[PDB]
């Protein structure tokens, strides 16, 4: 439905077409001579003045062609940089799963799919986004039997009456056990430790 | 009267929305009549920070997004003598005394075309076989 | 004999008693001294823009 | 030419010569604006910090914005700003004034202080600062027990380093 | 045109589509192992 | 006088062209630097690298 989404390729095409159009349009400039037609100058004067007339056209057209070549060089360099970035994205987000944040997609990356385009590529990125949050009360460690317990992976949370261990990115409470916790030291130096079993 | 200059044909308001047609100096205009206003950076919120409270997600969604990248452009070439003279012996003889003038241009254009081909082949050709579903 | 366009206002520069005009940088005249009243006037270019 | 009809008439026979120049200059200006917008506009909401500030002993006062100053900048930003200092040519003003840039920086910094890295993926989720720092140590191969037993020393070293940075700059 | 020429690309779009199809079938069927 | 006017005009045009080319090169390098800065902002502030 929506149009005007493929702005970059259209912009590149328009820039190239406009450059070619202005280059071919520059052919109708007097450049200070008597006419823009070569044969008319040839078939109206004498060679001693004819060559003087022709020199101006020669230098003007040479200058215009030089300018066009320089602009093409600059645009080619920029396009090369863009192509290198696209190649890196294709290598890293299609052939594998990326951990560098926001490189390809907004969220936690899962996979990507490539598609062709007349002068480029289109990546479809699939990402995971958490939702439906909830408040909880937490504590960094648990003091029990004079010992300090820390979670292996996850975090301590509370319904409001009891305590559970959860994984960091999805709510799934479980009972605190010696299997998913480890002990180090005594509950005397940790700031914020709470009592439990 | 704005820091960007002077503006006629629009009304100044005191609200602030997203910027449609950027004018400058932090202000821009939109259509309702035409109104000129100051840009709004975004929504305002104050996340509830406490030293013993956390938030944990309970559900998830899967999103699919697009990204578009150009990788190539058209390959073009230009014949120097035909463009600059156009079938004239006198023009060619006069131009000959300028030395090597368009060989560099042809070299550059051929390099550009080769670079475009290399860009395409490097971007897409990244497999050894042709797998089939 | 020194010609140019612009708009003239009253200035507060203090010319040393033997100069006729002053320029700030890049050789562009700013201040002049009127040959009759012997006071310093300042010149700014006429307004323009896109 | 500079106010010369003869110059304009003689120049008119050179074809389109400065249209592409103005095109290039406008492209450059648009590119500068796009660069600034891409660099700084990376958040959807303007986050704020709570009035009470107890970040487990850490001290961010030197970097947080100062409500007293009209510019709403910080100490380091003010130091950076203070430290560093026609015939037809014009200079256009940037689209984003420095106040909005400072607001973007403040929003980003409040978000990363309060919600860790969660605000960069979806909605910001609050987290005590000590737990986030424990997560960050756990992400480099060191258990959180080290932070939980050396919190005070870590905070003191961080404060000393952030204090030395300002002196080194000034 | 007065001496300007446009050269065709080496890879026709059918081969590009074939490359994309091969890559996409590979990543569906074999994960990241084929990389 | 038209000859002298043309002689002035060509040199002024050459100077303008040189300035434009220098501005283009500087803008390109500035854009590269800005892209690097944006990548660093995205990867080292919003997450752990
Ligand atoms: C604390 O968590 C527990 C465990 O989910 C909740 O206690 C349960 O509540 C239901 C409904 O009242 C009872 O049928 C169960 O027998 C309870 N479990 C136990 C072990 O007693 C409790 O609701 C949570 N606290 C709050 C405030 O909701
Ligand atoms: C988290 O914040 C709370 C509230 O600011 C702190 O609770 C204070 O603890 C001290 C010492 O135990 C008491 O003297 C105060 O009266 C408490 N404040 C209130 C409002 O009751 C707590 O110490 C902080 N740190 C944690 C929980 O680790
Ligand atoms: C966790 O339990 C321990 C022991 O059951 C509590 O330590 C006692 O604290 C009281 C009040 O400060 C003292 O009178 C006792 O002598 C302490 N007993 C021991 C063995 O040290 C501890 O206070 C509890 N934690 C909390 C937060 O209340
Ligand atoms: C979590 O708890 C807070 C405090 O009870 C809930 O209320 C929010 O509190 C903050 C700061 O105190 C305010 O800025 C919000 O406007 C409050 N929200 C509402 C709806 O009143 C908060 O709603 C709870 N949930 C979340 C996800 O934060
Ligand atoms: C997580 O979110 C999904 C998506 O909204 C929920 O699925 C919806 O459930 C409602 C009620 O059962 C249905 O009316 C919708 O049609 C479901 N959506 C889809 C896309 O199927 C899901 O229930 C949520 N999970 C929890 C635990 O709340
Ligand atoms: C040039 O001649 C005029 C005409 O007299 C002088 O102007 C007078 O200057 C005296 C000096 O104080 C004033 O008192 C008169 O009021 C002026 N008359 C006017 C302005 O009509 C002027 O000073 C002379 N400039 C010189 C000698 O440098
Ligand atoms: C964070 O560090 C700042 C220093 O930049 C502390 O501010 C100083 O506080 C002391 C004691 O109140 C004053 O004597 C100094 O004049 C303050 N310095 C400045 C520059 O204002 C600030 O107190 C520290 N934060 C906390 C919570 O102590
Ligand atoms: C609202 O806008 C008007 C003009 O647009 C201005 O004079 C006025 O100061 C603004 N604020 C209020 C509170 O009216």
Short mmCIF file of N, CA and C in Angstrom, two decimals, chain A residues 33-158:
data_model
loop_
_atom_site.label_atom_id
_atom_site.label_comp_id
_atom_site.label_asym_id
_atom_site.label_seq_id
_atom_site.Cartn_x
_atom_site.Cartn_y
_atom_site.Cartn_z
N UNK A 33 31.85 32.57 -27.59
CA UNK A 33 32.11 32.55 -29.02
C UNK A 33 30.91 33.10 -29.77
N UNK A 34 30.91 32.96 -31.10
CA UNK A 34 29.83 33.49 -31.91
C UNK A 34 28.65 32.54 -32.04
N UNK A 35 28.86 31.23 -31.90
CA UNK A 35 27.78 30.27 -32.04
C UNK A 35 28.16 28.98 -31.34
N UNK A 36 27.14 28.19 -31.01
CA UNK A 36 27.35 26.87 -30.44
C UNK A 36 27.40 25.77 -31.49
N UNK A 37 27.16 26.10 -32.75
CA UNK A 37 27.21 25.12 -33.82
C UNK A 37 28.60 25.11 -34.43
N UNK A 38 29.20 23.93 -34.53
CA UNK A 38 30.57 23.82 -35.01
C UNK A 38 30.66 24.10 -36.51
N UNK A 39 29.76 23.51 -37.30
CA UNK A 39 29.81 23.69 -38.75
C UNK A 39 29.51 25.13 -39.14
N UNK A 40 28.60 25.79 -38.42
CA UNK A 40 28.29 27.18 -38.71
C UNK A 40 29.52 28.07 -38.56
N UNK A 41 30.29 27.86 -37.49
CA UNK A 41 31.55 28.59 -37.34
C UNK A 41 32.53 28.19 -38.44
N UNK A 42 32.57 26.91 -38.78
CA UNK A 42 33.48 26.45 -39.83
C UNK A 42 33.14 27.07 -41.18
N UNK A 43 31.85 27.19 -41.49
CA UNK A 43 31.40 27.65 -42.80
C UNK A 43 31.02 29.13 -42.81
N UNK A 44 31.62 29.93 -41.93
CA UNK A 44 31.36 31.37 -41.91
C UNK A 44 32.61 32.23 -41.84
N UNK A 45 33.73 31.71 -41.36
CA UNK A 45 34.92 32.53 -41.17
C UNK A 45 36.14 31.93 -41.85
N UNK A 46 37.31 32.51 -41.58
CA UNK A 46 38.62 32.11 -42.05
C UNK A 46 39.35 31.34 -40.95
N UNK A 47 40.22 30.39 -41.32
CA UNK A 47 40.86 29.52 -40.32
C UNK A 47 41.59 30.31 -39.23
N UNK A 48 42.29 31.40 -39.54
CA UNK A 48 42.96 32.15 -38.46
C UNK A 48 42.01 32.64 -37.37
N UNK A 49 40.78 33.01 -37.72
CA UNK A 49 39.78 33.34 -36.72
C UNK A 49 38.95 32.13 -36.31
N UNK A 50 38.81 31.15 -37.20
CA UNK A 50 38.04 29.96 -36.88
C UNK A 50 38.65 29.20 -35.71
N UNK A 51 39.97 29.03 -35.71
CA UNK A 51 40.61 28.31 -34.61
C UNK A 51 40.47 29.07 -33.29
N UNK A 52 40.57 30.40 -33.34
CA UNK A 52 40.36 31.21 -32.15
C UNK A 52 38.95 30.99 -31.61
N UNK A 53 37.96 30.94 -32.50
CA UNK A 53 36.59 30.67 -32.06
C UNK A 53 36.46 29.28 -31.45
N UNK A 54 37.09 28.27 -32.07
CA UNK A 54 36.90 26.89 -31.64
C UNK A 54 37.56 26.62 -30.29
N UNK A 55 38.64 27.34 -29.98
CA UNK A 55 39.37 27.09 -28.73
C UNK A 55 38.47 27.26 -27.51
N UNK A 56 37.59 28.26 -27.53
CA UNK A 56 36.72 28.52 -26.39
C UNK A 56 35.76 27.36 -26.16
N UNK A 57 35.15 26.86 -27.24
CA UNK A 57 34.28 25.70 -27.12
C UNK A 57 35.04 24.50 -26.58
N UNK A 58 36.26 24.29 -27.08
CA UNK A 58 37.05 23.15 -26.64
C UNK A 58 37.29 23.21 -25.13
N UNK A 59 37.76 24.37 -24.65
CA UNK A 59 38.09 24.47 -23.23
C UNK A 59 36.84 24.38 -22.35
N UNK A 60 35.72 24.98 -22.79
CA UNK A 60 34.50 24.89 -22.00
C UNK A 60 34.00 23.46 -21.87
N UNK A 61 33.96 22.74 -22.99
CA UNK A 61 33.50 21.35 -22.94
C UNK A 61 34.44 20.49 -22.12
N UNK A 62 35.75 20.74 -22.21
CA UNK A 62 36.70 20.00 -21.39
C UNK A 62 36.45 20.24 -19.91
N UNK A 63 36.20 21.49 -19.52
CA UNK A 63 35.92 21.80 -18.12
C UNK A 63 34.67 21.08 -17.63
N UNK A 64 33.60 21.11 -18.44
CA UNK A 64 32.36 20.45 -18.04
C UNK A 64 32.57 18.95 -17.86
N UNK A 65 33.30 18.32 -18.79
CA UNK A 65 33.55 16.89 -18.68
C UNK A 65 34.38 16.56 -17.45
N UNK A 66 35.37 17.41 -17.14
CA UNK A 66 36.17 17.22 -15.93
C UNK A 66 35.29 17.25 -14.68
N UNK A 67 34.40 18.24 -14.61
CA UNK A 67 33.51 18.35 -13.45
C UNK A 67 32.63 17.11 -13.32
N UNK A 68 32.07 16.64 -14.44
CA UNK A 68 31.23 15.45 -14.40
C UNK A 68 32.01 14.24 -13.89
N UNK A 69 33.25 14.08 -14.35
CA UNK A 69 34.07 12.95 -13.92
C UNK A 69 34.32 13.02 -12.41
N UNK A 70 34.63 14.21 -11.90
CA UNK A 70 34.88 14.35 -10.47
C UNK A 70 33.64 13.99 -9.64
N UNK A 71 32.47 14.49 -10.06
CA UNK A 71 31.25 14.16 -9.34
C UNK A 71 30.99 12.66 -9.35
N UNK A 72 31.21 12.02 -10.50
CA UNK A 72 31.03 10.57 -10.58
C UNK A 72 31.97 9.84 -9.63
N UNK A 73 33.22 10.31 -9.52
CA UNK A 73 34.16 9.68 -8.61
C UNK A 73 33.68 9.77 -7.16
N UNK A 74 33.21 10.95 -6.75
CA UNK A 74 32.74 11.11 -5.37
C UNK A 74 31.56 10.19 -5.09
N UNK A 75 30.59 10.17 -6.00
CA UNK A 75 29.41 9.34 -5.79
C UNK A 75 29.78 7.86 -5.76
N UNK A 76 30.73 7.45 -6.60
CA UNK A 76 31.17 6.06 -6.60
C UNK A 76 31.81 5.68 -5.27
N UNK A 77 32.62 6.58 -4.70
CA UNK A 77 33.21 6.29 -3.40
C UNK A 77 32.14 6.10 -2.33
N UNK A 78 31.14 6.99 -2.31
CA UNK A 78 30.08 6.85 -1.32
C UNK A 78 29.31 5.54 -1.51
N UNK A 79 29.01 5.18 -2.76
CA UNK A 79 28.30 3.94 -3.04
C UNK A 79 29.13 2.74 -2.59
N UNK A 80 30.46 2.81 -2.77
CA UNK A 80 31.32 1.72 -2.32
C UNK A 80 31.25 1.55 -0.81
N UNK A 81 31.25 2.66 -0.08
CA UNK A 81 31.13 2.57 1.38
C UNK A 81 29.80 1.91 1.77
N UNK A 82 28.71 2.32 1.12
CA UNK A 82 27.41 1.73 1.41
C UNK A 82 27.40 0.24 1.11
N UNK A 83 28.02 -0.16 0.00
CA UNK A 83 28.06 -1.58 -0.37
C UNK A 83 28.87 -2.39 0.63
N UNK A 84 29.96 -1.82 1.14
CA UNK A 84 30.72 -2.52 2.18
C UNK A 84 29.88 -2.72 3.44
N UNK A 85 29.14 -1.69 3.85
CA UNK A 85 28.27 -1.85 5.01
C UNK A 85 27.22 -2.94 4.77
N UNK A 86 26.63 -2.96 3.57
CA UNK A 86 25.63 -3.97 3.25
C UNK A 86 26.23 -5.37 3.27
N UNK A 87 27.45 -5.52 2.75
CA UNK A 87 28.10 -6.83 2.77
C UNK A 87 28.35 -7.29 4.20
N UNK A 88 28.80 -6.38 5.07
CA UNK A 88 29.01 -6.76 6.46
C UNK A 88 27.70 -7.19 7.12
N UNK A 89 26.61 -6.46 6.86
CA UNK A 89 25.33 -6.84 7.43
C UNK A 89 24.88 -8.21 6.93
N UNK A 90 25.04 -8.47 5.63
CA UNK A 90 24.67 -9.77 5.09
C UNK A 90 25.49 -10.89 5.72
N UNK A 91 26.79 -10.66 5.90
CA UNK A 91 27.64 -11.67 6.52
C UNK A 91 27.23 -11.94 7.96
N UNK A 92 26.92 -10.90 8.74
CA UNK A 92 26.78 -11.08 10.18
C UNK A 92 25.35 -11.39 10.64
N UNK A 93 24.32 -10.89 9.96
CA UNK A 93 22.95 -11.08 10.45
C UNK A 93 22.16 -12.15 9.71
N UNK A 94 22.65 -12.64 8.57
CA UNK A 94 21.99 -13.71 7.84
C UNK A 94 22.67 -15.06 8.10
N UNK A 95 24.00 -15.08 8.10
CA UNK A 95 24.73 -16.32 8.32
C UNK A 95 24.92 -16.64 9.80
N UNK A 96 24.47 -15.78 10.71
CA UNK A 96 24.62 -16.04 12.12
C UNK A 96 23.72 -15.14 12.94
N UNK A 97 23.80 -15.31 14.26
CA UNK A 97 23.03 -14.51 15.20
C UNK A 97 23.95 -13.48 15.85
N UNK A 98 23.53 -12.22 15.83
CA UNK A 98 24.36 -11.11 16.26
C UNK A 98 24.05 -10.72 17.71
N UNK A 99 25.11 -10.42 18.46
CA UNK A 99 24.97 -9.94 19.83
C UNK A 99 25.19 -8.44 19.96
N UNK A 100 25.85 -7.81 18.99
CA UNK A 100 26.05 -6.36 19.01
C UNK A 100 24.70 -5.66 18.86
N UNK A 101 24.39 -4.76 19.79
CA UNK A 101 23.04 -4.24 19.93
C UNK A 101 22.74 -3.25 18.81
N UNK A 102 21.51 -3.32 18.29
CA UNK A 102 20.94 -2.39 17.32
C UNK A 102 21.68 -2.37 15.99
N UNK A 103 22.57 -3.34 15.75
CA UNK A 103 23.23 -3.43 14.45
C UNK A 103 22.23 -3.75 13.35
N UNK A 104 21.34 -4.71 13.60
CA UNK A 104 20.32 -5.08 12.62
C UNK A 104 19.04 -5.44 13.37
N UNK A 105 18.12 -4.49 13.42
CA UNK A 105 16.86 -4.65 14.11
C UNK A 105 16.82 -3.83 15.40
N UNK A 106 15.60 -3.64 15.90
CA UNK A 106 15.37 -2.90 17.14
C UNK A 106 14.82 -3.90 18.16
N UNK A 107 15.70 -4.41 19.00
CA UNK A 107 15.35 -5.41 19.98
C UNK A 107 16.40 -6.50 20.00
N UNK A 108 16.03 -7.64 20.58
CA UNK A 108 16.93 -8.79 20.62
C UNK A 108 16.84 -9.53 19.29
N UNK A 109 17.98 -9.68 18.62
CA UNK A 109 17.99 -10.23 17.28
C UNK A 109 17.73 -11.73 17.30
N UNK A 110 16.95 -12.19 16.32
CA UNK A 110 16.67 -13.61 16.14
C UNK A 110 17.20 -14.14 14.81
N UNK A 111 16.84 -13.51 13.70
CA UNK A 111 17.29 -13.92 12.38
C UNK A 111 16.94 -12.82 11.38
N UNK A 112 17.39 -13.01 10.14
CA UNK A 112 17.14 -12.06 9.08
C UNK A 112 16.99 -12.81 7.76
N UNK A 113 16.31 -12.16 6.82
CA UNK A 113 16.06 -12.74 5.50
C UNK A 113 16.38 -11.70 4.43
N UNK A 114 17.16 -12.06 3.41
CA UNK A 114 17.49 -11.11 2.35
C UNK A 114 16.55 -11.19 1.16
N UNK A 115 16.39 -10.04 0.50
CA UNK A 115 15.64 -9.93 -0.74
C UNK A 115 16.36 -8.97 -1.67
N UNK A 116 16.21 -9.19 -2.96
CA UNK A 116 16.87 -8.36 -3.96
C UNK A 116 16.08 -7.09 -4.23
N UNK A 117 16.74 -6.13 -4.86
CA UNK A 117 16.13 -4.88 -5.29
C UNK A 117 16.91 -4.37 -6.48
N UNK A 118 16.27 -3.62 -7.40
CA UNK A 118 16.91 -3.30 -8.69
C UNK A 118 18.35 -2.84 -8.60
N UNK A 119 18.69 -2.09 -7.55
CA UNK A 119 20.07 -1.68 -7.33
C UNK A 119 20.43 -1.77 -5.86
N UNK A 120 19.96 -2.82 -5.18
CA UNK A 120 20.29 -2.94 -3.77
C UNK A 120 19.70 -4.18 -3.15
N UNK A 121 19.69 -4.18 -1.82
CA UNK A 121 19.24 -5.32 -1.03
C UNK A 121 18.29 -4.82 0.05
N UNK A 122 17.40 -5.71 0.48
CA UNK A 122 16.44 -5.45 1.54
C UNK A 122 16.55 -6.56 2.57
N UNK A 123 16.74 -6.20 3.83
CA UNK A 123 16.82 -7.15 4.93
C UNK A 123 15.55 -7.08 5.75
N UNK A 124 14.95 -8.25 6.00
CA UNK A 124 13.83 -8.38 6.93
C UNK A 124 14.36 -8.97 8.22
N UNK A 125 14.29 -8.20 9.30
CA UNK A 125 14.86 -8.59 10.59
C UNK A 125 13.74 -9.01 11.53
N UNK A 126 13.93 -10.15 12.20
CA UNK A 126 12.96 -10.67 13.16
C UNK A 126 13.55 -10.49 14.56
N UNK A 127 12.79 -9.84 15.44
CA UNK A 127 13.28 -9.47 16.76
C UNK A 127 12.25 -9.82 17.82
N UNK A 128 12.75 -9.98 19.04
CA UNK A 128 11.96 -10.35 20.21
C UNK A 128 11.84 -9.13 21.12
N UNK A 129 10.61 -8.82 21.55
CA UNK A 129 10.35 -7.63 22.36
C UNK A 129 9.53 -8.02 23.59
N UNK A 130 10.04 -7.80 24.80
CA UNK A 130 9.24 -8.10 25.99
C UNK A 130 8.11 -7.11 26.18
N UNK A 131 7.10 -7.54 26.93
CA UNK A 131 5.91 -6.73 27.16
C UNK A 131 5.17 -7.26 28.38
N UNK A 132 4.21 -6.45 28.86
CA UNK A 132 3.37 -6.77 30.01
C UNK A 132 4.22 -6.98 31.27
N UNK A 133 4.87 -5.89 31.68
CA UNK A 133 5.74 -5.90 32.84
C UNK A 133 4.93 -6.01 34.13
N UNK A 134 5.63 -6.03 35.26
CA UNK A 134 4.99 -6.15 36.56
C UNK A 134 6.00 -5.77 37.64
N UNK A 135 5.51 -5.10 38.69
CA UNK A 135 6.36 -4.68 39.79
C UNK A 135 6.67 -5.86 40.71
N UNK A 136 7.88 -5.86 41.26
CA UNK A 136 8.28 -6.85 42.25
C UNK A 136 9.30 -6.23 43.20
N UNK A 137 9.43 -6.84 44.37
CA UNK A 137 10.42 -6.45 45.37
C UNK A 137 11.56 -7.46 45.36
N UNK A 138 12.80 -6.96 45.42
CA UNK A 138 13.98 -7.78 45.22
C UNK A 138 14.96 -7.61 46.38
N UNK A 139 15.94 -8.51 46.42
CA UNK A 139 17.00 -8.51 47.42
C UNK A 139 18.22 -9.16 46.79
N UNK A 140 19.43 -8.67 47.10
CA UNK A 140 20.62 -9.18 46.40
C UNK A 140 21.11 -10.53 46.88
N UNK A 141 20.84 -10.92 48.12
CA UNK A 141 21.31 -12.19 48.65
C UNK A 141 20.39 -12.61 49.79
N UNK A 142 20.50 -13.88 50.18
CA UNK A 142 19.65 -14.45 51.21
C UNK A 142 20.53 -14.94 52.35
N UNK A 143 20.25 -14.47 53.57
CA UNK A 143 20.95 -14.98 54.74
C UNK A 143 20.15 -16.12 55.35
N UNK A 144 20.82 -17.25 55.55
CA UNK A 144 20.19 -18.44 56.12
C UNK A 144 21.27 -19.27 56.80
N UNK A 145 21.00 -19.67 58.05
CA UNK A 145 21.94 -20.44 58.86
C UNK A 145 23.28 -19.72 59.01
N UNK A 146 23.25 -18.39 59.00
CA UNK A 146 24.47 -17.61 59.09
C UNK A 146 25.28 -17.55 57.82
N UNK A 147 24.76 -18.04 56.70
CA UNK A 147 25.47 -18.05 55.43
C UNK A 147 24.73 -17.20 54.41
N UNK A 148 25.48 -16.70 53.43
CA UNK A 148 24.93 -15.86 52.37
C UNK A 148 24.78 -16.69 51.10
N UNK A 149 23.60 -16.63 50.50
CA UNK A 149 23.28 -17.36 49.28
C UNK A 149 23.02 -16.36 48.16
N UNK A 150 23.61 -16.63 47.00
CA UNK A 150 23.45 -15.86 45.78
C UNK A 150 22.90 -16.75 44.68
N UNK A 151 22.12 -16.20 43.75
CA UNK A 151 21.56 -17.03 42.67
C UNK A 151 22.59 -17.30 41.59
N UNK A 152 22.54 -18.52 41.05
CA UNK A 152 23.43 -18.89 39.95
C UNK A 152 23.17 -18.01 38.73
N UNK A 153 21.96 -18.10 38.18
CA UNK A 153 21.50 -17.17 37.16
C UNK A 153 20.04 -16.84 37.44
N UNK A 154 19.70 -15.56 37.33
CA UNK A 154 18.37 -15.11 37.68
C UNK A 154 18.38 -14.01 38.72
N UNK A 155 17.29 -13.88 39.47
CA UNK A 155 17.15 -12.81 40.45
C UNK A 155 16.09 -13.23 41.45
N UNK A 156 16.23 -12.75 42.69
CA UNK A 156 15.25 -12.99 43.73
C UNK A 156 14.09 -12.01 43.57
N UNK A 157 12.86 -12.53 43.66
CA UNK A 157 11.65 -11.72 43.56
C UNK A 157 10.70 -12.16 44.66
N UNK A 158 9.67 -11.34 44.89
CA UNK A 158 8.71 -11.61 45.95
C UNK A 158 7.30 -11.32 45.46
#
